[PDB]
């Protein structure tokens, strides 16, 4: 149980945040990532629409099974590609999504192209407000009327240098008109997932913002474990992805959506055990759509 | 160094168990000759496929060498004859310490008599377990054999809540000490998959207050979880990995992971959790007690 009153956000019906055991973990799957084989052209955003739709439908089916809500991590390396990717996601799921590029120019460029349909405001989450945020990003976010952003509380390493960042990143996000802050302290490698999780606990303990991370960042490149094949890679992946949840995290970017079938079953199990602690902490489940009431 | 109490680290025939989080790798305890282990043709006389049994022990040694997770064998028996034969086989076919494991105190004492005095028994045999309703005969049998390590099942129908379970110790530790036990592996018990969170909280209380190595059998309900197991591979294994790694994330020292056939996936999951926990040591100042650790092996 965290000292700070925990912020629970409703993003187009997706609840995220609260005391551990209050709400299920929100699972965030990546689509059109670098080397996503359904993409034939990452510059023009040419991709297999049948394959993309099949991933979105699988996500909805797994979400319905476990009670873990989903937000799509929509990656793009160009304004043209990310715009087409988001247009596809808008039409083919109801889920909220991350507008995700490592380039702030791609993110702002895509935002301008996507326009001012109120569906953008309701579903689009800015990924992310980072250490080197620009006044232009803040102004573009405000002009778009976005209310949720990922805050990437990461620099160049200890949890303390990550909190130092929160003018802070929260103050900057507030200037952009952001009211809902999804705090991501960043993940540098597999081993230091423990450092990230430490930063997550400070965020929830001190501020009560939802806290999460991308434990996916180095796991898929861990060839020594991945080369062992199934189910050895998947249980190692499960250990890494569930670790932040055991330390009270609210959301996980689990990497490529093709991994959803094993990720959801692992994360749902951790959620169920943590919610059983509610009986000792006095925490009330915020929803009956929870792994504890679904997976047994 | 999250626990207040100085943590006991035990050396059981070279297997280190205990410490502060990230100091030592998780000790993994696989079950052999469990009820409906299909390598047993006769559970009453203890007739088993010795080649299949040796293959499991050899696989355990290989996985242990790969990750650095040490191993103790959970030797289950339903009769004095069977458990005697199982322990005689384990003694000759591995160096690993082992749990003398029956739910019947009469079977545990019976097997102890059959095995009798042997410096190997005093070195490697761990009594599984000293329980709420222990008998004076058990304590006298344990002292006669000269055992120095026992599992303490800190569980009662009357003590479901974490604080209540550990209240049994002081008590169960006194009973063990009367039997000449010097090393206590505290197991608060696992009733179901969901209440592993309760078991893990009980492990935290033991380590916080007493500093005894704390562990459990998250295996107890996992293999009977039909809804998840019916999904098959790798869905059952990642769900089982979530259950088995959970106590370790909260500072537990050893896991009874169930049937040894599961060791290939269990070792890879637990080694990963151990590696991440040990990387925290750069911030707490805990010194890894050994270089034979997942953090230095799995990457
Ligand atoms: C960088 N990381 C991240 C983060 O840490 N925080 C936020 N908010 N957003 C993001 N977005 C992107 C990323 C999370 N998503 C990921 C992370 C990693 C991969 C990945 O490893 N892909 C593989 C190829 C796919 C594969 O091997 O299966 C690669 O080698 O690049 C794919 C997607
Ligand atoms: C009860 N539990 C336990 C415990 O909680 N604490 C201690 N110290 N020792 C023990 N020893 C026995 C047990 C831990 N080991 C286990 C737990 C469960 C199983 C198990 O579910 N076996 C089943 C399923 C076999 C299978 O489906 O693979 C069987 O039919 O035998 C097999 C072994």
Residue numbers in the entry:
A (entry chain B): 3 to 158, 161 to 170, 177 to 306
B (entry chain A): 2 to 171, 178 to 306
Paper text:
During energy production in Desulfitobacterium hafniense, MtgA catalyzes the methyl transfer from methylcobalamin (Cbl‐CH3) to THF in the catabolism of glycine betaine (GB). Despite its lack of sequence identity with known structures, we could show that MtgA forms a homodimeric complex of two TIM barrels. The topology of each subunit is characterized by a funnel of eight parallel β‐sheets connected by α‐helices on the outside that form a complex of two perpendicularly oriented TIM barrels. The active‐site cavity is located inside the hydrophilic core of each barrel.
Herein, we present X‐ray structures of THF‐ and THF‐CH3‐bound MtgA that allow us atomic insights into the reaction trajectory of this catalyst. In contrast to substrate‐bound MtgA, the entire cofactor is defined in the MtgA:THF‐CH3 complex depicting extensive coordination within the amino acid environment in a rigid manner. The overall binding motif of the pterin ring remains similar to the substrate‐bound structure. However, the THF benzoate moiety is now involved in a π‐stacking network including Tyr230, Phe243, Phe251, and Trp272 on one side, as well as Tyr35 and His38 on the other. While the functional groups of the THF tail engage water‐coupled hydrogen bonding interactions with adjacent residues, the terminal γ‐carboxylate forms salt bridges with Arg236 that coordinate the cofactor in an extended conformation. Mutation of Arg236 to alanine resulted in impaired enzymatic activity, thus implying that fixation of the THF tail during methylation is involved in catalysis. Besides this fixation, the superposition of both ligand structures illustrates a rotation of the pterin moiety during the reaction of approximately 35°. In contrast, the benzoate group of THF‐CH3 displaces the carboxamide side chain of Asn227 by 2 Å (red double arrow). As planar sp2 hybridization would be expected in this position of the final product THF‐CH3, the X‐ray structure must depict a trapped protonated reaction intermediate. On the other hand, the WT MtgA:THF‐CH3 structure illustrates an intermediate that forms immediately after CH3 transfer from Cbl‐CH3 to THF.
